[PDB]
Amino acid sequence: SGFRKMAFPSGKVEGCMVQVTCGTTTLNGLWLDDVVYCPRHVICTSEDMLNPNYEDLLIRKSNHNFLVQAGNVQLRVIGHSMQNCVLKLKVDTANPKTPKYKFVRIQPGQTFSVLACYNGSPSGVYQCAMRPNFTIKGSFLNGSCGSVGFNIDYDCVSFCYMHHMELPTGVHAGTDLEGNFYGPFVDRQTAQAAGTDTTITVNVLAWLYAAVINGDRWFLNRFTTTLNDFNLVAMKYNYEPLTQDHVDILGPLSAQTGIAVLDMCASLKELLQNGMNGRTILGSALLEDEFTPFDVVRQCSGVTFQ
Amino acid sequence: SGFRKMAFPSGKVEGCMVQVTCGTTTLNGLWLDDVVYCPRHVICTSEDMLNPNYEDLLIRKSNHNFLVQAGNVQLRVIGHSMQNCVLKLKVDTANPKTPKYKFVRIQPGQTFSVLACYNGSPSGVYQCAMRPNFTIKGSFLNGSCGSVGFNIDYDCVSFCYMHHMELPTGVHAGTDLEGNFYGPFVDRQTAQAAGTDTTITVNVLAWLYAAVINGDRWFLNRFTTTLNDFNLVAMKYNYEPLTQDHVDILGPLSAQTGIAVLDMCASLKELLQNGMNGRTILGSALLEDEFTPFDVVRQCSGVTFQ
Numbered sequence: 001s002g003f004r005k006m007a008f009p010s011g012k013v014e015g016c017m018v019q020v021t022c023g024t025t026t027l028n029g030l031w032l033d034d035v036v037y038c039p040r041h042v043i044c045t046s047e048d049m050l051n052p053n054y055e056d057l058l059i060r061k062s063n064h065n066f067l068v069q070a071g072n073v074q075l076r077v078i079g080h081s082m083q084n085c086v087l088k089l090k091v092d093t094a095n096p097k098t099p100k101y102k103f104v105r106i107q108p109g110q111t112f113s114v115l116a117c118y119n120g121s122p123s124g125v126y127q128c129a130m131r132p133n134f135t136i137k138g139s140f141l142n143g144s145c146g147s148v149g150f151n152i153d154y155d156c157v158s159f160c161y162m163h164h165m166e167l168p169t170g171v172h173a174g175t176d177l178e179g180n181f182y183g184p185f186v187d188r189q190t191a192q193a194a195g196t197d198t199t200i201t202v203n204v205l206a207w208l209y210a211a212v213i214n215g216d217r218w219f220l221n222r223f224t225t226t227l228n229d230f231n232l233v234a235m236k237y238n239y240e241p242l243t244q245d246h247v248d249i250l251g252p253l254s255a256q257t258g259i260a261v262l263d264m265c266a267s268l269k270e271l272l273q274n275g276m277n278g279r280t281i282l283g284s285a286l287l288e289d290e291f292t293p294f295d296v297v298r299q300c301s302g303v304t305f306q
Numbered sequence: 307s308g309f310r311k312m313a314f315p316s317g318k319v320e321g322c323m324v325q326v327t328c329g330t331t332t333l334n335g336l337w338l339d340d341v342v343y344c345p346r347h348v349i350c351t352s353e354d355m356l357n358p359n360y361e362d363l364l365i366r367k368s369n370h371n372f373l374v375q376a377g378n379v380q381l382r383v384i385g386h387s388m389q390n391c392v393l394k395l396k397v398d399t400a401n402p403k404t405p406k407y408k409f410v411r412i413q414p415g416q417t418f419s420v421l422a423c424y425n426g427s428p429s430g431v432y433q434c435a436m437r438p439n440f441t442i443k444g445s446f447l448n449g450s451c452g453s454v455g456f457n458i459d460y461d462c463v464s465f466c467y468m469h470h471m472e473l474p475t476g477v478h479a480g481t482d483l484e485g486n487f488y489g490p491f492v493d494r495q496t497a498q499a500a501g502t503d504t505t506i507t508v509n510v511l512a513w514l515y516a517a518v519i520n521g522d523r524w525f526l527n528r529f530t531t532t533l534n535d536f537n538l539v540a541m542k543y544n545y546e547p548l549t550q551d552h553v554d555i556l557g558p559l560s561a562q563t564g565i566a567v568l569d570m571c572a573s574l575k576e577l578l579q580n581g582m583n584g585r586t587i588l589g590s591a592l593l594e595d596e597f598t599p600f601d602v603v604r605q606c607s608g609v610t611f612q
């Protein structure tokens with residue numbers, strides 16, 4: 001038993017990270033087959049980042065202006081193109097460590113692992129969730145751009161995130177691997193407000209089920225509720241509304257614990273109105289929403305990968 | 307900026323995990339050079355685990371009773387010996403993925419990454435601390451034994467933990483890689499009490515420094531204190547006493563933030579006596595003690611590894 005914020009094993013992604021240098025700027029790239037993907041602001045200087053015209057900046061760059069390094073080996077760039085906010089550098093060498101991979105654009109509330117890198121070398125791995133306002137609460141410093149977020153499905157790595165920027169409020173924004181930003185953000189150094197950050201209700205419920213599986217049952221009450229009555233309370237506390245699809249997704253967790261979803265909603269309603277009164281749940285004094293129902297099943301059943 | 311519970315990249319350890327089967331029992335082994343390390347209770351049946359005599363049980367086992375599998379490849383066992391609570395199986399093939407490695411026995415308060423495995427395949431990675439009572443608060447199910455804890459120092463993997471058992475209270479116990487248990491535990495299925503779990507004060511202070519580096523300064527007060535006066539308050543709340551060595555270790559964090567260690571101790575003293583009043587620090591409503599001063603420097607400066 002026990003419950004931890006668990007990241008995916010990073011071995012399959014570590015072998016795909018390279019260092020990309022253009023002039024003075026160095027960030028990380030993702031080397032898959034004979035293509036390196038990296039944020040397009042690698043072609044910017046520090047003054048270009050206030051109001052970059054990426055088309056005009058890219059005209060003055062040739063293949064030989066991009067230095068791609070995989071540890072101590074040099075990759076020769078034989079072609080380059082811009083796809084939305086990412087650059088695709090065609091190199092002369094296919095990555096021999098290329099895993100089975102897929103590009104996926106995730107939905108808010110879904111979780112993934114981030115392999116934080118600097119100069120193309122892994123620094124650490126952690127788990128996070130795409131917030132409802134399309135930000136992530138990450139840990140990134142200068143030089144971390146090009147670090148990727150991923151999920152693993154048995155033997156297939158699903159890349160879903162590439163890091164680009166930090167907002168003035170301390171949260172982080174990036175793109176999918178086709179270069180499309182999550183949310184309304186643009187890759188320029190300007191004031192950009194993020195919307196309201198709401199709590200992922202279906203994830204909180206899955207975490208409460210994980211608590212019951214692990215022996216924390218003090219929050220279970222004798223009340224029940226309805227979907228409409230719960231959502232009326234949930235909206236007041238900036239919680240995401242619960243839908244029938246969410247109830248179906250929680251179905252297997254409800255069957256394993258013998259606690260109906262609406263009964264768990266009533267327990268959550270009491271926690272939202274009266275607080276936790278200094279108590280803790282799974283070692284936390286707040287309601288955690290960065291575990292999906294799948295994350296809970298995966299950790300409480302011991303799913304493994306290639 | 308930002309701060310996350312960050313684990314080490316697991317790639318170098320994933321290539322060392324194998325599956326070890328003896329009769330009906332299957333757990334994980336660590337394959338380094340031509341030696342596989344695994345918990346010795348792999349030779350037990352379910353009834354042997356109440357009161358195992360490991361010497362008598364091992365007499366009835368030959369080399370060919372141990373089935374070692376690295377994915378789909380079979381390793382031939384050419385020798386076996388018991389070193390404390392671990393078995394060393396000599397195999398005919400040296401692991402070609404053997405990294406630069408070291409065996410280290412860690413001290414309470416130190417942190418490390420756990421690669422949770424089942425059937426020799428990685429399931430996930432998370433960060434934890436050796437508690438002062440020599441337990442860890444992990445996430446382990448049946449079949450997880452032989453999973454290892456590790457640190458990375460540039461290119462060298464330091465193995466410090468191998469998982470063996472879960473206590474009735476839900477916490478976890480294991481050995482170093484020489485088979486010596488952390489704490490007074492023994493590998494038999496019997497009631498074993500753990501001591502009082504105290505809070506690692508030096509780790510809390512490092513985490514408060516990480517909060518200041520990341521813009522959370524509401525808890526900073528105008529008071530200071532002395533080491534003796536702080537420890538008098540710390541002992542009442544089951545906090546580990548702070549020593550002069552701890553002050554020296556926090557030195558670099560104190561110099562980077564311009565906040566003297568004793569001034570931070572006064573802020574902690576106020577948090578212990580008056581609580582946090584519903585506020586949060588780095589997104590937590592409790593005082594976190596699973597970040598060492600080195601972990602904080604490493605994450606806030608972007609240290610990378612091979």
Ligand SMILES: *[C@H](O)[C@H](C[C@@H]1CCNC1=O)NC(=O)[C@H](CC(C)C)NC(=O)OCc1ccccc1
Pocket residue numbers: 027041044049140141142143144145146164165166167168172186187188189190191192307
């Ligand atoms: C890429 O490595 C870097 C990552 C940042 C550095 C601090 N933390 C991060 O996540 N990204 C940038 O420097 C990025 C580049 C633009 C061309 C998009 N800008 C950025 O994040 O600036 C921070 C900021 C911008 C505007 C107002 C306040 C802060």
Ligand SMILES: *[C@H](O)[C@H](C[C@@H]1CCNC1=O)NC(=O)[C@H](CC(C)C)NC(=O)OCc1ccccc1
Pocket residue numbers: 001333347350355446447448449450451452470471472473474478492493494495496497498
């Ligand atoms: C090895 O895979 C396994 C790991 C356990 C299973 C549940 N969570 C874990 O961490 N270890 C054992 O089954 C271990 C074997 C003995 C020979 C040491 N026993 C164990 O942890 O039993 C749990 C327990 C023992 C006594 C009282 C209450 C619970």
